[PDB]
Design a protein around this ligand. Structure first.
Ligand SMILES: [Hg+2]
Length: 762
């Protein structure tokens, strides 16, 4: 009897599935659908098992949903723009376009060889004009809606205008809490307050914003930015000269060097005074370079005792320092050597004395609103999105500097046609490019994050040359049911995407306001890596510089316990010394990547898929090991052997039987079959792919145990049929192969087995 052999059968089925177009997505789903999306990769060459873990996950879900009868959209594309292609050009002296298309061909083959099936008709390549013309289109619509502006002097997207919705809409979002929390923390909603300071002898009252209203009684002076309209106006007669000069000198500088840590503290007393609303005390008004006009109201109240910058300023110019916050368990030192910036208890704050700091902010705000001295104001840490880039390989900003927007019908604004590779601001060295008539071209390209903030919508209508996409098509496929990928480092991408969707929704183009209904997070794939020799003495491990550098840690010494805790192990080398080994993120740089092409050629696709899928929960990190590979071989070998051994008998057997009439082991098998179907189905729907495989391994053992006592029976034949259907999503090639031994059509046409509720009883 022969044995399982991945070679030949896999290439056979891969072509079969493609030609049959089983995974082609309909233009408009009708009565349900499933949109399975995996984060598209940067076209940087051949992929390794780390990348394939995500793509395999997507293929499993897609095949499963397809078998259930859903209309499935599982597309692949390329995040082609960016620096990678540019660095390559400067290295190999090749056009970025050529390097990209070559890498695309390789990655595509790697995906195909793993048995991954996409609707390639919906392929997108971001570096193509057919795609980035729509980036420019969207950019104009944002400009037209006041969401895109220029500021000193690059372009920005007013994402902060959606800060509140980006935060609020998270509540109804069914994502992992850890991801939602990272979104919340990045946006950073904070409770603040705008306080009004009356100016002695003047009509004007100076507005000041602060997140520490709890320290109001400690405000000993005000500080206006030099560019503040009140700096010169309030400047006393015998101070206007000095102030005027300072203001001018301030402009000659930049906000970076003004807010630069280390520089000496400079400033000028305006000769004018303000009244502290809380104490009614008279405080001097100053102007200083460290205060910028762009933030808050361009003016701040200074609380030396609780803000280190104000402390240094007060100390340098001899300004009063008043303590109003203390630690709960001890009074502050006297005199004060530095500012105490942490929460505590309010003191020297009139009626607020003894009030806990955080709660005190609310009391003071509420107090200010009642007396009409100030109001609560919400602030966000989230800043606007800087999209301007001085690079060649990117989407050109559709703007002209006569600042006029390029006409919608004149789009796209194509990139210059080089002559040199070193020729790559890059757009500035192209006179025949920026030289145009007013309706000079902008010489900046868009941050590639712009490209990826809506690619999932383009997939719904990839060939539309009139709009980024037809609302009808997009609304039919959206939202994405499961977005697959690592999130640990995708805070921005997720935020930017949600932003784009909400904007496109405001334009009436998208029904939903949240692009990803579900996040299928994937942990990193690791691989045992040799970091170098070490020297051990007692419980201490000395790390030679080369070894320590590869590990990227500050310790030149580790305890045996530290080594264990990090998941490392000291292993004897033939060189006669011990080396420190440890699972490390699989990446080309680390030189620990397991390339798809080579592996599949030497082993197989199903073997790789099972190795990845069974290693651990998808959300957890996993280590690719030869042990896992052999375990995969063993499992596939046993499935093949079981069916091969009973092939002759199975052929002469009918699968028709009466469940109620089953007895003994036959009835026991029927029960186990359906319990397995339930576990596998629910594990798949819950994204617990490793446990689904475990259930299949367990049921395979039950099949072997059954055949010890019973022959090939109708119920057994049905169990084999169901098994192959349940196996298809995980190891599609072997499943399809064995299926054709007894059945005519493809597993894609067999559907998903129907669960028998009653069989689960008792
Ligand atoms: Hg391109």
């Amino acid at each position: 009897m022969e044995k399982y052999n991945p070679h030949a059968i896999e290439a056979k089925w891969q072509r079969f599935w493609e030609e049959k177009g089983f995974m082609k997505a309909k233009d408009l789903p009708g009565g349900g659908k499933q949109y399975v999306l995996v984060m598209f990769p940067y076209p940087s060459g051949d992929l390794h098992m780390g990348h394939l873990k995500n793509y395999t996950m997507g293929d499993v879900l897609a095949r499963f949903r397809r078998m259930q009868g859903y209309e499935v959209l599982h597309p692949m594309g390329w995040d082609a723009f960016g620096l990678p292609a540019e660095n390559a050009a400067l290295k190999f002296g090749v056009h970025p376009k050529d390097w990209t298309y070559a890498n695309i061909r390789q990655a595509k083959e790697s995906l195909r060889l793993m048995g991954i099936l996409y609707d390639w008709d919906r392929e997108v390549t971001t570096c193509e004009p057919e795609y980035y013309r729509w980036n420019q289109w969207i950019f104009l619509k944002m400009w037209e809606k006041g969401l895109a502006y220029r500021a000193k002097e690059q372009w920005y997207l007013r994402i902060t205008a959606y800060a509140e919705r980006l935060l609020k809409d998270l509540e109804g979002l069914n994502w992992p809490e850890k991801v939602k929390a990272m979104q919340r923390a990045w946006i950073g909603r904070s409770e603040g307050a705008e306080i009004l300071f009356p100016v002695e002898g003047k009509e004007v009252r100076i507005p000041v914003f602060t997140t520490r209203p709890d320290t109001l009684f400690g405000a000993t002076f005000l500080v206006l930015a030099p560019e503040h309209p009140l700096t010169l106006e309030l400047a006393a007669p015998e101070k206007r000269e000095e102030v005027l000069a300072y203001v001018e000198a301030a402009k000659r500088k930049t906000e970076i060097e003004r807010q630069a840590e280390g520089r000496e503290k400079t400033g000028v007393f305006l000769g004018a005074y303000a009244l502290n609303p809380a104490t009614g005390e008279r405080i001097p008004i100053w102007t200083a370079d460290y205060v910028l006009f762009g933030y808050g109201t361009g003016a701040i109240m200074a609380v030396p005792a609780h803000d280190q910058r104000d402390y240094e300023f007060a100390r340098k110019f001899g300004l009063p320092i008043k303590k109003v916050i203390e630690r709960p368990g001890e009074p502050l030192p006297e005199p004060l050597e530095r500012a105490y910036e942490e929460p505590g208890i309010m003191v020297n704050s009139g009626p607020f004395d003894g009030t806990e700091s955080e709660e005190g902010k609310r009391k003071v705000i509420a107090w200010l609103e009642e007396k009409g001295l100030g109001k609560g104001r919400v602030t966000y840490r989230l800043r606007d999105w800087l999209i301007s880039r001085q690079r060649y390989w990117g989407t050109p900003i559709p703007m002209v500097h006569c600042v006029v927007p390029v006409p919608e019908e004149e789009l796209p604004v194509l990139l210059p046609d080089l002559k040199d590779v070193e020729d790559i601001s890059p757009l500035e060295a192209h006179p025949e490019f920026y030289e145009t008539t007013c309706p000079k071209r902008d010489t900046d390209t868009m941050d590639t994050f712009f490209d990826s903030s809506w690619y999932y919508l383009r997939y719904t209508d990839p060939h539309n040359d009139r709009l980024p996409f037809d609302p009808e098509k997009a609304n039919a496929w959206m939202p994405v049911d499961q977005y697959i990928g690592g999130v640990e480092h995708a805070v921005l991408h997720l935020l930017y995407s949600r932003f784009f969707t909400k904007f496109l929704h405001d334009l009436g183009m998208v029904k939903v306001e949240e692009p990803f209904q579900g996040l299928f997070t994937q942990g990193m794939v690791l691989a045992w890596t040799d970091f170098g020799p070490v020297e051990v003495e007692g419980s201490v491990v000395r790390l030679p510089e080369p070894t320590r550098i590869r590990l990227e840690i500050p310790e030149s010494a580790l305890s045996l316990e530290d080594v264990r805790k990090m998941g490392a192990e000291l292993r004897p080398h033939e060189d006669g010394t011990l080396h420190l080994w440890k699972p490390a993120v699989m990446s080309k740089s680390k030189g620990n990547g397991v390339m798809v092409g080579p592996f599949v050629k030497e082993q197989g696709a199903d073997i790789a898929r099972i190795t990845i899928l069974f290693a651990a929960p998808p959300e957890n990190e996993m280590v690719w090991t030869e042990e896992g590979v052999q375990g995969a071989w063993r499992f596939l070998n046993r499935i093949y052997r079981r069916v091969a051994e009973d092939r002759e008998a199975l052929l002469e057997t009918s699968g028709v039987f009466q469940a109620e009439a089953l007895e003994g082991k036959d009835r026991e098998l029927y029960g186990k079959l359906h319990e397995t179907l339930k576990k596998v189905t629910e594990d798949l729907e819950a994204l617990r792919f490793n446990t689904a495989i475990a259930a299949l391994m367990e049921f395979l053992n039950a099949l072997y145990e059954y055949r010890k006592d019973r022959p090939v029976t109708p119920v057994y034949r049905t169990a084999i049929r169901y098994y192959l259907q349940m196996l298809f999503p995980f190891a599609p090639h072997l499943a399809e192969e064995l299926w054709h031994w007894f059945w005519p059509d493809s597993l894609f046409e067999a559907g998903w087995p129907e669960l028998d509720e009653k069989a689960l009883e008792k």
